[PDB]
Amino acid sequence: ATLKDQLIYNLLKEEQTPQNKITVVGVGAVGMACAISILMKDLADELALVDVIEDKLKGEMMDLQHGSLFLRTPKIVSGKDYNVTANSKLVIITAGARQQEGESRLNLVQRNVNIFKFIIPNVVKYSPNCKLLIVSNPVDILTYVAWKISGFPKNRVIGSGCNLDSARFRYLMGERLGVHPLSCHGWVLGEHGDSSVPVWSGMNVAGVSLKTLHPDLGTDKDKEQWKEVHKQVVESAYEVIKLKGYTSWAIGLSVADLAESIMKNLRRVHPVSTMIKGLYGIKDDVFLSVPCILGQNGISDLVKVTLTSEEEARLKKSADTLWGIQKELQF
Amino acid sequence: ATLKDQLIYNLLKEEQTPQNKITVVGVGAVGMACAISILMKDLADELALVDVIEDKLKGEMMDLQHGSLFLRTPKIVSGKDYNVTANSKLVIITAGARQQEGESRLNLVQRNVNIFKFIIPNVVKYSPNCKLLIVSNPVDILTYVAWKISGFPKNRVIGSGCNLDSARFRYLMGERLGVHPLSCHGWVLGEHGDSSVPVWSGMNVAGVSLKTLHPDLGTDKDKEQWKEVHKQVVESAYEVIKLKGYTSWAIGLSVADLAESIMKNLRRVHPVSTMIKGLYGIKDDVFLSVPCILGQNGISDLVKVTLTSEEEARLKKSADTLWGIQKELQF
Amino acid sequence: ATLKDQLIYNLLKEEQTPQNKITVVGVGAVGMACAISILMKDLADELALVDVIEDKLKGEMMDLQHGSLFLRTPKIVSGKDYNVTANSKLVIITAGARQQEGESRLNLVQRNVNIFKFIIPNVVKYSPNCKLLIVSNPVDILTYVAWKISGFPKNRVIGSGCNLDSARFRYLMGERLGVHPLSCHGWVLGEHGDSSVPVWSGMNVAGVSLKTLHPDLGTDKDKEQWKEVHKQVVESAYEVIKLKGYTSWAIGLSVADLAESIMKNLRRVHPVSTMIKGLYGIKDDVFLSVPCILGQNGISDLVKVTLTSEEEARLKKSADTLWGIQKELQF
Amino acid sequence: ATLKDQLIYNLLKEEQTPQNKITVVGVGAVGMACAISILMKDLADELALVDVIEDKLKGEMMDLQHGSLFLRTPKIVSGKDYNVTANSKLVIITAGARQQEGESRLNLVQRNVNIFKFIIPNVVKYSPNCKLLIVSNPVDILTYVAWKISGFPKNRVIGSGCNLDSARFRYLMGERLGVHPLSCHGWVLGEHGDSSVPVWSGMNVAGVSLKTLHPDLGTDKDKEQWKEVHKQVVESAYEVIKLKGYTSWAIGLSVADLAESIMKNLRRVHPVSTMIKGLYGIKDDVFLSVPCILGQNGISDLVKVTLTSEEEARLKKSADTLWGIQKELQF
Ligand SMILES: NC(=O)C1=CN([C@@H]2O[C@H](COP(=O)(O)OP(=O)(O)OC[C@H]3O[C@@H](n4cnc5c(N)ncnc54)[C@H](O)[C@@H]3O)[C@@H](O)[C@H]2O)C=CC1
Ligand SMILES: NC(=O)C1=CN([C@@H]2O[C@H](COP(=O)(O)OP(=O)(O)OC[C@H]3O[C@@H](n4cnc5c(N)ncnc54)[C@H](O)[C@@H]3O)[C@@H](O)[C@H]2O)C=CC1
Ligand SMILES: NC(=O)C1=CN([C@@H]2O[C@H](COP(=O)(O)OP(=O)(O)OC[C@H]3O[C@@H](n4cnc5c(N)ncnc54)[C@H](O)[C@@H]3O)[C@@H](O)[C@H]2O)C=CC1
Ligand SMILES: NC[C@H]1O[C@H](O[C@H]2[C@H](O)[C@@H](O[C@H]3O[C@H](CO)[C@@H](O)[C@H](N)[C@H]3O)[C@H](N)C[C@@H]2N)[C@H](O)[C@@H](O)[C@@H]1O
Ligand SMILES: O=C([O-])C(=O)[O-]
Ligand SMILES: O=C([O-])C(=O)[O-]
Ligand SMILES: O=C([O-])C(=O)[O-]
Ligand SMILES: O=C([O-])C(=O)[O-]
């Protein structure tokens, strides 16, 4: 008999449907950072990777598998064919178009739409019950696009949104105050990147509102120029890109944190991009970041942050601009 | 008063006295895989990064800092100047050229010896009591080089060695038997390279020797071709490099594994590059992998594996190859 | 409008079942050590507790719940009624009388069988697909009883068995060798109790056979008296009982280690109580520890350990001692 | 000659002085819950236990040691003599009388002062540079006593304080709001006991002030009776004590949480017992919980909370009750 049969007496065969499966789509730097972060937090019992680039895909799989001894995720698989993603609880999309010399925000989004029209139906075919976490940029528009193509109810389509923006805000807040980011509390909401909104009113340490100690916080009337902290959040991605080519590590950690809440049904509150029609005067099918309760069903609830009229008008303006673009798309 | 002063009453102005500081030298694929692995395993209270490409360096540091919210490593610093590395307990050298598709690690040696002549004096200046963990290829030769340039005693100069080769081996064993790598035991010793030695006599599950069950194990007349598993270990780096252009994740996890044992004083046994003059008839200052006890003072002890005379010969043959290259180097 | 209404907007009313639910029956010393160990290892999304002592049950539940902020298991419940236990993946049984100073574990059979006749049918009614993990003593006999009462197939009824004895053995081996127990390999099989069998032939560090180095190992005229190491393993519970009254922490951790393999489908090998009819000359339905591959379907496979004729005779003796007790049961 | 020497070739004899040693004094329910929580969080490379009852102490030590295989804390030691405590970074004092069912923690003062008169000088003799973490009740008063007796600067004498009371408060908040405690922020300050102070004005989810949404929050006329939540917090220990005899798991986890900030130098904010003379109108050497930044040097800073004058008067009353007792004590 074979060595294996001499060593091992089998009791039964027949596998079970995978219980805690995560899929990552796109094995570029962002996707791989999400993968390694997920593996190191033991969030999945199986991890599938999918991309069109067959060699890199396989290479990344192999390199992760070679580290199996040091992990507690016993099945890692990959393939260009989406059958490898079947029965995933959570599917993380990082795939997208790359920008060139110019050219047009509309053009850029349209090329992602085209890429999504292939990816999204493939994902829903094999994991009809999954939650979709959209990480690709521009994330708020692309969460809309994934929602539209999947036909998934809004609770199961989530955009990473201002999750990383807020964690960046808390880091920079921590640097200034000499306090770990965990104990610095602060929310950046609305549209990811340029037009995000720093909610100065919720900024606190140990429940002490920075705005109470310092009423002019964040305005042009404060000597400490905390507005600069929000600018840095907006600008920090551009600087990292300029310096190393791209962002990856912070997005990976940020995403694993969302995955943790989802996979473990924690019901923690995260700033993620969600369909906000009917909130803040918004009447269009648009996704923006507000604080959401994350769990086994995706977004079960959201928190209604009291915004000033200025803050509401910023979110409304963002919604208008996003809808302006989405209205012109074809799928 | 500044907002910070209104919020926070200072009791003491502390010092910058890190207790468990790790420095990673070189922030390419391998360096950053080592860094994220370390960060996600809470092995350090301070992470220092060093490189000669300053924009890359700053960008990688910033990207890690933006994830501080999701970490428990409160200080992450970097710089081209080695003063940021001061008082490191562990310094991990990942700097230098890497093998391209189809290229031997031994072909990297002149390029990387030059960069070790720059790096090593600068690390010893600012962390004279650190342990050196050498990752750059050819890792065995460069462990000797680091040992020689540093003037450190041999216990504090450790090459990542065959910790990875043995991990890969156990993964492949695992795939063949349907058993998790944790419960598959087997050792690859010698060069981290083409002349590595698979110790067939030591391979086991639950302490039952595979060689005893299957006397033709790893031989030519092996119908099951277990020699192909070791071949696959040998070829694994090249296969991953052919597919994705480099290896990173598996070595990142191997290095973290080694770091864990050192920083937590675990006294686990790892196959790491060490000075083996006096064993197996070797009488030159050759470094290569044999199982070592790893802890707070680096390698405290060597395990003496019972090798066959063929295995012992392989190891000697490998030793003489490495000494052939090292003898011509000057410092 | 309630505070909750004003603060939170609800999308999803329904609540899907818990995906990774564990139940611990018996909230005495062992039950709670299992509980805390499992909670700190993030192995469950829901933890259910059962006991016949209502006060103590509720008190223990509340004490854990108060620590929720520091855990990642969002639902902790209890009741004397087994409806709280429904849809459990894993049900760990720790209820029953414990041996006092000097008392054999086997002296507990009549008392703990009678308790099992009430507990097991209730567990099965509410979690028909669960894996049963038996900890109550005598654990080997009670696993047999749990198998017979439940009507479950043998793969899904596991006794904690010699996972603990083996951990103790490796600790003691470690203390003697100056090596972490992780790197010391030695197996103790058969009864979790006085007739346990140390497999000397399999003891190793880095795959090097201690027995081969030391032919007297485990013999009476061994100058180093290694039989004393196995003696200490046999005696360990008795010593701990006489010092603090009972054992809890170590079994807590051993149980969590088993639950980890089961809940995460790791396919690691553990010596656990299982039906070994048909090996080592055993013709009856004896349960005792042999190495088993442990995963999502419980015990999927047994490792056939190659015992010396003395080792096998001791193991056969162990099976005879156990069947002698089993043989006269009523349920 | 020995098996050990045939197996292992030694390089170094020198060793000793762990980097991250923690001592727990008192191995009753609280001490051992701290111990297991600390071990499972890998906060220490050595753990020392002390108690006056020698058999109990050895039994608890041995039980933990038997689980060594499952932990990454390679040295666990105990003794009645404080020499085993030498060189601790952190010493946790749990030894003392515990309150009976109908009993104030403040009724324990004389008994536990007596105990600290013996314990503290012995602790400081062997670890003059440790941080003291006081858990024994009444924790605030005994933190003052520890500070007085030891001669340590106030930054290095820390009471577990309201870290637990706040966790309970957040758990109960989470239950009412359908949200994980991590995302529910509310602070209970002052005495770890009956005069604790709920900071209604700082309570929030995602930076949204609950008091502004619901102005009667915390008042008598509140239709939702939120004041009942703080009543539950005050009564929680007595309720748990009535049900199971004592509290252990939540304080263990809370203490582990404090230990993690200290040992890893995180500079997170925690409500812990410290000397609050000079603030909130308090002019005496009272120790009470306020939010403090915890790190490598203990309490490096404290956060001044902008209490409402109603909230401030309650804290002042807590200060007055505690001073009434403090001022009578004999050294
Ligand atoms: N021991 C092992 O098993 C493995 C070793 N390696 C080796 O690790 C090394 C690095 O590989 P990668 O990170 O993929 O290469 P990489 O090109 O991505 O990064 C190398 C880094 O070293 C830096 N560097 C060069 N000279 C330097 C100096 N004087 N001081 C500081 N930094 C300097 C470069 O600027 C670059 O950032 C290679 O030699 C590779 O073969 C890679 C995988 C596994
Ligand atoms: N397999 C192993 O290695 C180990 C086994 N043990 C065994 O574990 C068992 C438990 O020991 P401890 O927790 O120390 O005892 P304990 O007396 O502290 O707790 C046992 C609990 O089981 C409960 N119980 C009794 N009848 C019950 C029923 N019909 N349904 C539900 N709960 C019931 C009791 O109310 C009690 O709370 C004993 O048989 C002991 O000998 C203990 C240590 C290690
Ligand atoms: N701060 C907090 O939130 C909490 C505080 N506690 C308090 O912690 C203390 C311990 O409670 P348990 O552990 O439940 O009590 P316990 O009775 O289980 O343990 C007390 C231990 O202290 C030891 N001890 C007594 N005098 C000693 C001395 N002179 N030297 C060394 N050891 C000595 C005893 O031998 C005993 O093992 C009590 O004061 C209790 O009220 C308890 C829960 C929470
Ligand atoms: N035939 C199958 C399908 O294959 C592609 O799907 C892939 C995307 O193309 C990838 O993204 C690409 O975008 C760049 C634009 O510059 C390209 O150059 C480059 N090759 C890629 O990186 C993305 N990461 C993964 C995704 N699975 C097409 O989109 C799709 O229409 C077509 O039906
Ligand atoms: O979206 C991004 O790439 C980012 O913010 O890092
Ligand atoms: O050294 C290498 O490149 C490897 O083995 O991954
Ligand atoms: O069975 C027991 O009590 C033990 O071994 O701890
Ligand atoms: O102090 C106590 O006993 C408590 O609150 O658990």
Tab-separated table of C-alpha atoms and ligand atoms in Angstrom, chain C residues 99 105 137 164-165 168 192 236-237 241 247 251, ligand 7:
chain	number	residue	atom	x	y	z
C	99	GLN	CA	-11.707	12.614	41.588
C	105	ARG	CA	-10.683	8.696	37.589
C	137	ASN	CA	-13.775	11.879	33.667
C	164	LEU	CA	-3.186	17.057	27.987
C	165	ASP	CA	-0.922	14.111	29.051
C	168	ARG	CA	2.607	17.664	30.168
C	192	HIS	CA	-6.059	9.484	30.080
C	236	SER	CA	0.496	15.138	37.656
C	237	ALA	CA	-3.283	15.439	38.165
C	241	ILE	CA	-5.446	17.981	43.062
C	247	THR	CA	-7.070	20.836	37.836
C	251	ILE	CA	-7.180	21.161	30.532
E	7	LIG	O1	-7.962	14.304	34.497
E	7	LIG	C1	-7.439	15.238	35.149
E	7	LIG	O2	-7.986	15.700	36.174
E	7	LIG	C2	-6.182	15.818	34.644
E	7	LIG	O3	-5.363	15.084	34.033
E	7	LIG	O4	-5.979	17.045	34.815
